[PDB]
A paper describes a structure:
Seven of the transmembrane segments (TMs 1–4, TMs 8–11), are referred to as the “core” domain and the remaining seven helices (TMs 5–7, TMs 12–14) form the “gate” domain of the structure. In contrast to the previously reported SLC26a9 cryo-EM structures, the cryo-EM density for the IVS loop resolved in the [name] structure shows a more ordered, interpretable density. The angle between TM8 and TM14 helices of [name] and of Slc26a9 is 57° (for [name]), 61° (for Slc26a9, the intermediate conformation), and 67° (for Slc26a9, the “inward-facing”, open conformation). We speculate that our cryo-EM [name] conformation, showing a narrower opening to the cytosol, would explain why this protein shows reduced ability to transport anions in comparison with Slc26a9. We reason that our [name] conformation solved by cryo-EM represents the contracted state of the protein at 0 mV.
Unlike other members of this family, and unique to membrane proteins, [name] functions as a voltage-driven motor with rapid kinetics, likely providing cycle-by-cycle amplification of sound within the mammalian organ of Corti2,3.
Numbering used by the authors:
A (entry chain A), B (entry chain B): 13 to 158, 165 to 580, 614 to 726
Amino acid sequence: TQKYHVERPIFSHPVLQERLHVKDKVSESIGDKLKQAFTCTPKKIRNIIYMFLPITKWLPAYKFKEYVLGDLVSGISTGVLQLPQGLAFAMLAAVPPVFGLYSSFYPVIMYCFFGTSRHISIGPFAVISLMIGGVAVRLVPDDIVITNGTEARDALRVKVAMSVTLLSGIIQFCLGVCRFGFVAIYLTEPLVRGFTTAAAVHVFTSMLKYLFGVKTKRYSGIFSVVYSTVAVLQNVKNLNVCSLGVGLMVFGLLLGGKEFNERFKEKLPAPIPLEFFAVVMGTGISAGFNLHESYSVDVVGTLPLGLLPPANPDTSLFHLVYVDAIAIAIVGFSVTISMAKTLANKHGYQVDGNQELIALGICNSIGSLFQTFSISCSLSRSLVQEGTGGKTQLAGCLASLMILLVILATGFLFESLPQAVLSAIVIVNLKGMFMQFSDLPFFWRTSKIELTIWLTTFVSSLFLGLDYGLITAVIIALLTVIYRTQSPSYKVLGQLPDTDVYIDIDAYEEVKEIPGIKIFQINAPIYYANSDLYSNALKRKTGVNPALIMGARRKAMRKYAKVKYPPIVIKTTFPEELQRFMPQTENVHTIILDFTQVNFIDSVGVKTLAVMVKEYGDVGIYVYLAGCSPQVVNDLTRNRFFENPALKELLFHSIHDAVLGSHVREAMAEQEASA
Amino acid sequence: TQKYHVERPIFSHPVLQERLHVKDKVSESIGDKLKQAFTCTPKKIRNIIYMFLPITKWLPAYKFKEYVLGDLVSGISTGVLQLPQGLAFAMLAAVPPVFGLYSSFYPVIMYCFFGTSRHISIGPFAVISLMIGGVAVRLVPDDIVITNGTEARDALRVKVAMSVTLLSGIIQFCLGVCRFGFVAIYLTEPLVRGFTTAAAVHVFTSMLKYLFGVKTKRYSGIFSVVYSTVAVLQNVKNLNVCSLGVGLMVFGLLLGGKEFNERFKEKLPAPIPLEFFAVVMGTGISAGFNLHESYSVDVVGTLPLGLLPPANPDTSLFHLVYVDAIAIAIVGFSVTISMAKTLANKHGYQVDGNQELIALGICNSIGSLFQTFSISCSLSRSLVQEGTGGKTQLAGCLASLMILLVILATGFLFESLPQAVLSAIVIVNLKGMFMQFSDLPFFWRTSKIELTIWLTTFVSSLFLGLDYGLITAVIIALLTVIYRTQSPSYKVLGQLPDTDVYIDIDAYEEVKEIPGIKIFQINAPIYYANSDLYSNALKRKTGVNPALIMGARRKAMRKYAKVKYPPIVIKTTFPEELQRFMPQTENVHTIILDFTQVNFIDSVGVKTLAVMVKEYGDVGIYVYLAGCSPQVVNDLTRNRFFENPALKELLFHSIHDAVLGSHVREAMAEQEASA
């Protein structure tokens, strides 16, 4: 074997630098980058087309042998779940459900043409629908001045909804083309899991009132979940029993069917789309028993059979829906990129945030001309597509084809459909995300920092609106790194004999401390927020406090009473007469602070290091720096730390190098004192 | 000399760990900390008294020999500047100036008894006065229903001012006693410099309208500076010429006097208090020439001579001044701790944020009973106290004594005092902070990160209210560390022969790369926000892209066409027949990623590292980890990275250790292939 044997001299900073020569520093200029990426080679243009327009990329990669059956099953299940869930979001958004039908067909195909993620399901989303409904209510109130019909009111509501949807689409496209979308590098896996869980709880609390069959005022904004829950709880007295009863029966039936599908996962060739049987039996019972006026239950109502021509929305209303459209676009992009990243990490591939944002923005912008409200990623549909075995985006295309087949022919069958059934089917297909709470014990016993980031994201995202909840979750997520820096290892370390290794004294029982040597290590980049903490930790853990040493020297003195710079370290001037009565200690001649684990030095860090070196020299203690990175040396010579040229020799390439240099200097001092 | 000579075996993780034994892990329990700090020794109680009540600490340390003359001069100058500046803040706060006189005497003495900083000047501050005036206007408008006097209106204004001041004092005390104040570890030196500069510009723009002798509506809140400047500019047409003229003459006189004092700093024994001569000549000219009705200029008015008894403020109004008092307390504490830290770093000592907050809160709370509005640190007075040679807080006591001597006897002399003179003297004594702009070129050519943090703090603190401006300046200040992490060194490094040193290949011209070895180093803690960046940088800079290698192998294949886990690294299975037509490269057998510079590993980092190792093994490339810190090894074994026990041997204590281990494994493989 090749034994670890090296014979080199000491490599402090001056003696190492005198053996090295500076580069020629090859020219890396702005013009060199500028002329590149403009030659317009066929490969470059093909790559640009592939990145911007990805449908032409993976269609030749599609394989008929092993993808067709899975894609067909996934598309069938996606359409089956997309019908009533889309209707539910539509009737939640204070618009007729036919507009939800439009918003379930065009955007999916447009995202298939332009989107990157191949496993998420695109369509209407809950909190987007709540925002749209709140905007429409704020513009067009419940009572407006135009028998006693509401067609004009619904027309005004859909006009303002289309206006805010188009504004959100344009601003999303503008953000995407302006290279915004790098923030997808944020949104940590606990963070996105907590965000999706909070969104799920928001959907549950939003559709709880629709399950109960009670109509109340809609709440949008901060503290929306608690206000909605209070509104539901205050109106439980005014309740209908038959709608709640049928909702509970369909709830139990769907829960039993899902448990049966999970229990018999090995037996059936594919999971049967029980969500279609559920809705068809629900509408059959509603039509047969005629609950719409016998019990006066809420019904989704008549469904037009049309494919209305494109229309230009109302631009003039953009002036009042600035912040609303901004919030809608931010939340939609965040949810879409969150679910895309989650599914990509689940499978193994990757998604592009910029491409997702551009595709979503242009999709919303074009679909707004098609009388469709704002879209996002449907989390429940995305998980069920992942579970059933989705592999491509053509499952969404099949879902859109099924939606179209319903619209043109089957649309009049759902006129007698209770909204409680839609609410309950949304809850049962959303119950699959409440199993994402299983990471809480997965994070408690394992990396509690992920636990607290998950809790912070979930709390700030549930009890507060998503548009500010996610930005504050990201803020505390990134300040978590700051906190982790502010609590370093702070370990004093020695060495075990006849080795280069230097390990914590409280680690392994044979790393004997070198007598007279104290080595302090920090696992932090020692910037302003922890420079004083580092100084205090060094003064405490190593047991060498310069202020305490000076105080002890002064009290011993009073007890016994009855350009050229000065040297950094002054020798002890107290004679043996005064030194007879002293609190004698180990009297370490040097302390070395290795900088192998630091990343950079801040200006406050430079000042703290300089004053530390000055204080220890005033006491009479040499201070050496071990293993400073070239960036750290650059940050030191950047400031006025190296104004005194007699500080370049306090720098050492390694801890062992610093220890050996201290030993050599001690031997030289002893030889000079003797000889 | 002691040459660096070591003879030790290879120290990969298993062979190193088998030579070490785990601790007994001495008991560090909660109860051990709990019983400590409750024995109530005389030293402990004395230290608690010293920390909470510091006036008893440094009074015995006061020396009559070298402090008396400097303290007397500093106190004289502080009182001289405190008189008209305090009057100006009072008449800006929509309250009679006598209340500013009260707010210039009691709080200074109370802070002397309780405050820690020994060089800052305590009194009224501008933006605090703007907030108080805005609150008083919002509660009591300009036109209220109670000849045609305003004494009742002024009484209501001072009542609401005292109420909000007391609320700010109580909440400041509550924050201080609740150990809040650790945020003083933030507020970097560029950040506090920019904050003070923005505050100075706010004072200038606020008192510009008072210099012009025009009365407009007061603006408080976000974008206050631009609104105030627009209000001043729109009313330059409605102007008086005599007040502006006398303001310009006193401006020029004070500028000339300050330049003369600076030019003759060596000659005079002490800088003469020209601010007293200025105000006395101004009020003498105002009384003699009688401008109050000849030119109808603004006059500070009659000044009562009283020491009014303590009164209880209006508690019931607390319900409406929540956010206002919160902002006032936050801004006051921030300014005080900022100037305290700046002066402490200028001199060398340190200040306690918690003690400063407690002292300020209790000072404001008690002084609110004395008909005084909210206080803070006066920046201009603090700098002039620092410059004149302040050493103790008794200079503030002398300033308060001078203010009292003015109140009881000399108070009726300032009845005929134009407000333009007060505005101009504030500007001339505030011009000393506009020299703090000199750090902009000190930061451009030196550590541009400090430049951008300074610019961010100044912009967010000037063009936006201080209460949110400072919190957002802190937010971007702490995200600056995140950005600095997201742009690591990203250097591929080799070694120079016969040494342990490993240095960047683009550094010094003799660090020859070991053939078949690629070493990648990151100066970042490789968490979620830069894991993908690290992977891309490794795949790009080292020229080894596993996806590209697999693609090249597949294209060569198509060209030539006409629990027990599997081993991590699979041997190349392509025969020599297919290997004849290949894009042959260096074919590095290993790549080693040293973790000496990283601080921790995130869960996303663990996943990225695992998938990286898997991909490189699939290609057939060994991956080793060099110099992982014990925290990094703990973070790796924390996750499921070490589920496969054949990954513990990819860990090495040093880069040279990993290189030698790779060499030994290559030699063993060659020996096995041959023999």
